[PDB]
Amino acid sequence: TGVSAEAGEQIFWGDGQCSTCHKIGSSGSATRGPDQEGLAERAEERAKELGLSSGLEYLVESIIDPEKYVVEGFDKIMPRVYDPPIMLSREKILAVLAYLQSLGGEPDLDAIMKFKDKIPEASKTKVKPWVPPLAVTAEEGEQVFFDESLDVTCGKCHMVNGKGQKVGPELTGIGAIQTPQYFVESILEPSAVIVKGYETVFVITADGIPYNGLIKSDTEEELTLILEESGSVEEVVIPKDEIEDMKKQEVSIHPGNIGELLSVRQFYAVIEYLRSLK
Ligand code: HEC
Ligand code: HEC
Ligand SMILES: [Ca+2]
Ligand SMILES: [Ca+2]
Ligand SMILES: [Ca+2]
Ligand SMILES: [Ca+2]
């Protein structure tokens, strides 16, 4: 569809997967990444802070090396979209850059095209095939994911296509977006990346009672938390008028001991299941 902001808009909201994490003002509802309304002017400010040549250069860097600068208040969750699974082509990345410049600015197509030689070509990805060390399948991993007889049951906290229970985020579609490495880290190192909105808070009430958990809901009169202990979860409803302090902690309720609770087979099967969630 060429290199035009119009093409880029279709890709951002489509096969680039950008809108699965980013909203633009009142368009979209995704929150895993920052709202991109006003991004073109923000990029000019980022480039100044970072000693880059232009806002455009910051936008390019943000796609080609997402980890190089991490927006405050977010973790290293954005994938390299020119690598698997997304495998977004170079022409589509150039188009998306034109779209990003249109978010409060003016696309500069000649300037974008000069960055072509810095954008990796998806077909030339250097990522190696994911090969688990024993034979596992996605269907086997689905069984593990929902198995309530294990010492961890992913489905107690994550929904897929209407199955499971919501504590952490819904995982439907994540295999179209994320890498097996991100799945490994998410399972075994849960606090390395905290999905936005799923932070643990530490609350203290006026009566001196502590509660540490994630926020399920937050109304004008009640804060509902989900607490976790030994893989089980529990709700508590705290009257807002009784809250003395609340602080976000960079820690996850996803358990930290899954490497002790899943066999090698179960673990690699679950990864294959996650990859399959297109
Ligand atoms: C969720 C898994 C994401 C996907 C898919 C995409 N992005 Fe993203 N992006 C995400 C986060 C959490 C962050 C902030 C942390 C960081 O890496 O800096 C970003 C950031 C950006 C930025 C910078 C925004 C800023 O305010 O400075 C840009 C320009 C950006 N992301 C672009 C972008 C595009 C075009 C995507 C589709 C090809 C895309 N992102 C996907 C999370 C996620
Ligand atoms: C509730 C006590 C949980 C259990 C059991 C499991 N997960 Fe979890 N997970 C939970 C939360 C609250 C969060 C968000 C905060 C964070 O740590 O990032 C997560 C996150 C993930 C992710 C990342 C999702 C994303 O959108 O990027 C993945 C891939 C994930 N969790 C996988 C997963 C698996 C496979 C589990 C069973 C072995 C599992 N989780 C259990 C909460 C809880
Ligand atoms: Ca970044
Ligand atoms: Ca995590
Ligand atoms: Ca009140
Ligand atoms: Ca209790």
Author numbering: 39 to 316
Sentences reproduced from the published study:
Kustd1711 is a putative electron transfer protein encoded on the nitrite oxidoreductase (nxr) gene cluster of anaerobic ammonium-oxidizing (anammox) bacteria and consists of two heme-containing domains and one additional domain. Here, we describe a diheme cytochrome c with high heme redox potentials of about +350 mV, despite having a large overall negative charge, which typically reduces redox potentials. High-resolution crystal structures, spectroelectrochemical measurements, and high-end computational methods show how this is achieved: each heme iron has a calcium cation positioned next to it at a distance of only 6.9 Å, raising their redox potentials by several hundred millivolts through electrostatic interaction. We suggest that this has evolved to provide the protein with a high redox potential despite its large negative surface charge, which it likely requires for interactions with redox partners.
To improve our confidence in the assignment of the various transitions, we mutated the distal methionine ligands in both the N- and C-terminal heme sites to histidine and cysteine. To confirm that the sites can accommodate these mutations while maintaining six-coordinate heme binding and calcium binding, we determined the crystal structures of the C-terminal domain methionine mutants M292H and M292C to 1.12 and 1.70 Å resolution, respectively using the same crystallization conditions as for the wt protein, that is, including 200 mM Ca2+. This showed that these mutants are able to support both six-coordinate heme ligation as well as calcium binding, although in the M292H mutant, the plane of the distal His292’s side chain is at an angle of ∼75° with the plane of the heme porphyrin system rather than perpendicular to it. The M→H mutants, however, yielded data with clear transitions and little hysteresis. As the mutation of a distal methionine to histidine in a c-type cytochrome typically results in a drop in redox potential of ∼320 mV, in each mutant, one of the two transitions in each of the two pairs can be expected to drop by approximately this amount. In addition, mutations of either of the heme sites’ distal heme-coordinating methionine to histidine change the relative amplitudes of the various transitions. To at least some extent, this could be explained by changes in extinction coefficients caused by the mutation. However, it is also possible that these mutations have compromised calcium binding. That the crystal structures of the mutant showed a fully occupied calcium site in both domains is probably because of the high (200 mM) calcium concentration used in crystallization.
